[PDB]
Write a protein that binds this ligand. Structure first.
Ligand SMILES: Cc1ncc(C[n+]2csc(CCOP(=O)(O)OP(=O)(O)O)c2C)c(N)n1
Ligand SMILES: Cc1ncc(C[n+]2csc(CCOP(=O)(O)OP(=O)(O)O)c2C)c(N)n1
Ligand SMILES: [Mg+2]
Ligand SMILES: [Mg+2]
Ligand SMILES: [Mg+2]
Lengths: 527, 527
């Protein structure tokens, strides 16, 4: 307890941390030594995997996740993953070991040069302490910065000789600090907003990932029912904020300016909750909103409020605001929206699987409290239409579009939610980015199901190339990957589905298995 | 070529670039479209692999390598690899596609936020142009910044709508620009240095990676022979700068302060060429130099000159300086140094392989012009003692200690040197970091030999834990990886060696094979 090591672990446990996601190195050994018995360590083989797992775990648990990486090389390997963490507002405490203070100036091997600048601009806060005794206070800042709205990844670099040094005896005041950002709009202005919602003749609601992060899903259901309002999920959705077969639900918005203003045409008040306004992707110029539509955004993120090209904004906690609004608005006497029609069953022969067939089969066979992850980039629209997701925390997709998220994140989610079957639907291209994460699932017996959609190509990129009139583009096809052999390589049970009969058979086997299972599915291909 | 696209490819070809190492994304399609017939594209499945391959290629070819990655996520995935590239002074031109200019402010999906700050502090230059017409001039800056001493990675972010825009007609002046940093110390001061070397009673030479980068190896042989001086390789060596069985050669320096000053005791003048002074790693306090020893460093890098804790320094081109010194110093009439003794042949039974046995066997069987890569971290000393490397460009080791270098870099080196057999000796832990690079070797039929040293553990970390008296450390063992299955997964021929007879058999097969080959070697293990 007298040491920085002892004091830091005490701070961590008192702040509710009990798991370390890591890949170790020399600079981290003085931190990891005498690893306390009330903590667990989750090893992954590459740092993109470490951070991916921790990210899934944080998102599903709705609590900060603690990460330990090796210096610049380890931090650097994780920076694509940190890109995703930024956009999903994932509360990640990223720590990295630094060389001993005496060896920094000469730039010894393993020195993290100008360390705090390395993860910038992706992190909320980034720091290397000026002394050993400062380390617990620096850790306190990291914990709270990650945890306060808008939540996000933070970075702390610690010289390895710091851990053995005497702690400041006054560091005890850090242990039980409670910091809240659970705030909502003042009574007067909240009343004005509620009045505007009550007065709307044709309101619409758009929900984003911070709704699911806040577990505000049920309150948003109540709000939608009271306002009798259609509900969309904001484009490029990292999470699912609403039951997908509720009568109000209208699906995933296309990531385009004109496309969204068209969907919102005729709606006089559009209430956006917990979403950027908006995560557009494709070139689709036009009006941000059509005449007669006003927009009000509730966001936990000042930068989201600042960068919205239209509408009013309120910067507040999504949980507190959704609860306030759901409980304050009048019950409208308008007709409840009609449920969206069932998607068509596509023609399926005895050959390669249409993605539509895969999602239909999953929906038929998976438990109702399944959790899905998506990194099958060309099939996102079909997935959203065909999976009935009733419960919160049921969907995750790389928040910044960074591939290599879903495979490790599915392992972290499954760890956070041992009673809910996790099924990751991942493209053949996407599977390779963080392929080594499979080993963590096998070693810790984390029973994630991985469904590899093998069409031999970067399907989404072919679609983008068509849109952009981009001809003669190299590097779009990925033939000759045996995913069963890869799963075997990392100790994961592997199955193949070349047709529907095999798909049903493989899913049946996977859903009854005691460990992780990979199913390679032969899907229809433009190759 | 009226477009930015046409002008930029013309600049690239006129500057000698003909290969693009990449993993494509949406923002890169307008750059990659109409890919010119005089260029080749080398696809890798993850960006650490892309950069690793390009790095190996650049180091072996002694020319800049051109890289194309996807936005923040792709750049981020490659940042551990950029750490290595920084320390090896690798001339890498890293380009990344950005969102269209119109969609940056709203932060559309695939936007690289504050892009130029992302790869900092790892790169020597980092930039996003303010207009489309500036792109060729920005590319020109990138090419020359990467190429001038001290060589290093650079970063350029380009909004994807820039490529179709009209180029500045004055961009033609960029095409044939020749920029030289091939400089040496002025005559007067060079004369003073030569006189100091001539006057030394007991000189020693220490060489670093910039010697091999400069192909200054032969000049350093001449210098060592003229001075009759023992030659060491500077600690944490990324490259081999000297024939390892030349009588002057004294091997790899231990990465410690006291250890190095002890080796240099009695030497009145120590000439360091092309190395930092020094890449110490382990805690080993003492004198930087013992009384009676003075040090003179020749470095291509101002930061290396600035941060040396001792000695005089000259900042100049390594090729020009080695050539000048080798040709100006008098031939000493001192006795030529005695060659280092043979390493002992360790006892080897019919069971698991001692690393010593592996290197002895490789040295017996590999061609004299083989190129070795090292990422078997616990066996580095044994490797240096047991492999006779006569030629330049014969050795590569992760410059910043960042794992995941050797496997992809071995593919790049083999591409650069099709007539020299590349053999990568990689630990079981290290193999996973960039495992997907194997696919590139299979798809382009790049006949690299991968030797996996499988001891089931992070061996070097166990050693570090003993030095630091770090007990109860989690995450040090990596059981249950089948490397043959992994190689099969990516289409690479796979062999196993459980004993010496099998090792000899597997190496014989690998050396006669037409494609890439992985050999999993069961090595001796502390568990
Ligand atoms: C780290 C990273 N690299 C590259 C990309 C660009 N990218 C976006 S979608 C895609 C295709 C993925 O292919 P696959 O997983 O097979 O799914 P499909 O598109 O075939 O459905 C690529 C390479 C990215 N978003 N992130
Ligand atoms: C990207 C990265 N992650 C982690 C480390 C820390 N590290 C250094 S050596 C090592 C062990 C590598 O094990 P292996 O490849 O099996 O070789 P061995 O030590 O067993 O010879 C690790 C994890 C690093 N240098 N870089
Ligand atoms: Mg695909
Ligand atoms: Mg940075
Ligand atoms: Mg090992």
């Amino acid at each position: 307890m007298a040491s920085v090591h002892g004091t830091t672990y005490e701070l961590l446990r008192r702040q509710g941390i009990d798991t370390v996601f890591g890949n170790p190195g020399s600079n981290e050994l003085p931190f990891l030594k005498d690893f306390p018995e009330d903590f667990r360590y989750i090893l992954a083989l590459q740092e993109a995997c470490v951070v991916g797992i921790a990210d899934g775990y944080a998102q599903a648990s709705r609590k900060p996740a603690f990460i330990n990486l090796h210096s610049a090389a380890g931090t650097g390997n994780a920076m694509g993953a940190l890109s995703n963490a930024r956009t999903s507002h994932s509360p990640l405490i990223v720590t990295a070991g630094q060389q001993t203070r005496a060896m920094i100036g000469v730039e010894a091997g393993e020195t993290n040069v100008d360390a705090a600048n390395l993860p910038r601009p992706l992190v909320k806060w980034s720091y290397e302490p000026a002394s050993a005794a400062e380390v617990p206070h620096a850790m306190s800042r990291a914990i709270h910065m990650a945890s306060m709205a808008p939540q996000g990844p933070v970075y702390l670099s610690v010289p390895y000789d710091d851990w053995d040094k005497d702690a400041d005896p006054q560091s005890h005041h850090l242990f039980d600090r409670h910091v809240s950002s659970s705030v909502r709009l003042n009574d007067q202005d909240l009343d004005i907003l509620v009045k505007a919602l009550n007065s709307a003749s044709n309101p619409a609601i758009v929900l984003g990932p911070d709704v699911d992060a806040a577990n505000a899903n049920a309150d948003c259901v109540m709000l939608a029912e009271r306002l009798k309002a259609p509900v969309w999920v904001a484009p490029s959705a990292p999470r699912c904020p609403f039951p997908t077969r509720h009568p109000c639900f209208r699906g995933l918005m296309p990531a385009g300016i004109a496309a969204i203003s068209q969907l919102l045409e005729g709606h006089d008040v559009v209430l956006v909750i917990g979403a950027p306004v908006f995560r557009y992707v494709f070139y689709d110029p036009g009006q941000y909103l059509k005449p007669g539509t006003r927009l009000i955004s509730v966001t936990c993120d000042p930068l989201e409020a600042a960068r919205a090209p239209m509408g009013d904004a309120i910067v507040a906690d999504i949980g507190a605001m959704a609860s306030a609004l759901a409980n304050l608005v009048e019950e409208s006497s308008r007709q409840l929206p009609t449920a969206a029609p069932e998607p068509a069953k596509v023609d399926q022969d005895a050959g390669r699987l249409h993605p539509e067939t895969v999602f239909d089969t999953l929906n038929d066979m998976a438990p109702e409290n399944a959790i899905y992850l998506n990194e099958s980039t060309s099939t996102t629209a079909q997935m959203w239409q065909r999976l009935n997701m009733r419960n919160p925390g049921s969907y995750y997709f790389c928040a910044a579009g960074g591939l290599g998220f879903a495979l490790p994140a599915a392992i972290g989610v499954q760890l956070a939610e041992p009673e809910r079957q996790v099924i990751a639907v991942i493209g053949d291209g996407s599977a390779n980015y963080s392929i080594s994460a499979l080993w963590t699932a096998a070693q810790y017996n984390i029973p994630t199901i991985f469904v590899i959609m093998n069409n031999g190509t970067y399907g989404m990129l072919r679609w983008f190339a068509g849109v952009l009139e981009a001809e003669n583009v190299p590097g779009l096809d990925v033939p000759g990957i045996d995913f069963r052999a890869l799963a075997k390589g990392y100790g994961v049970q592997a199955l193949k589905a070349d047709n529907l009969e095999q798909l049903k058979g493989s899913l049946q086997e996977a859903l009854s298995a005691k460990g992780p299972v990979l199913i390679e599915v032969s899907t229809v291909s433009p190759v």
